[PDB]
Amino acid sequence: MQIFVKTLTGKTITLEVEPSDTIENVKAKIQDKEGIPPDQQRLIFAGKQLEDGRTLSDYNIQKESTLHLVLRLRGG
């Protein structure tokens, strides 16, 4: 299925995912597309930051959802 990922610079990319994909694997797919390692990504859906070990399914993320990517350095 298809989901969207939009950034703070307004940009939107699309991903080919399955609900069974982990959030970490979704970041790998962003990395495959954009070159940014997963640990520099934060993914947000409905205002909650998604945990790497859970799935799109666990968050009831259906096709044509938009996740929000926020880049953040390893830490804070």
- Write out the residues near its own copies by the rule CB under 8 A: 1-2, 11-14, 16, 33-34, 48-49, 51-53, 64, 75-76
Instruction: For residue 57, give the 3-state DSSP assignment.
Output: helix
Phi, psi of 38 (to 5 degrees): -55, -40
Residue listed under structure tokens 């979704």: 26
Q: C-beta of 12: minimal distance to its own copies in Å?
A: 7
For the bound state, the minimum distance from the C-beta of residue 39 to its own copies, rounded and expressed in Å, comes to 11
DSSP 8-class letter at 51:
P
Task: Find the shortest distance in angstroms from Cβ 16 to its own copies.
Answer: 6
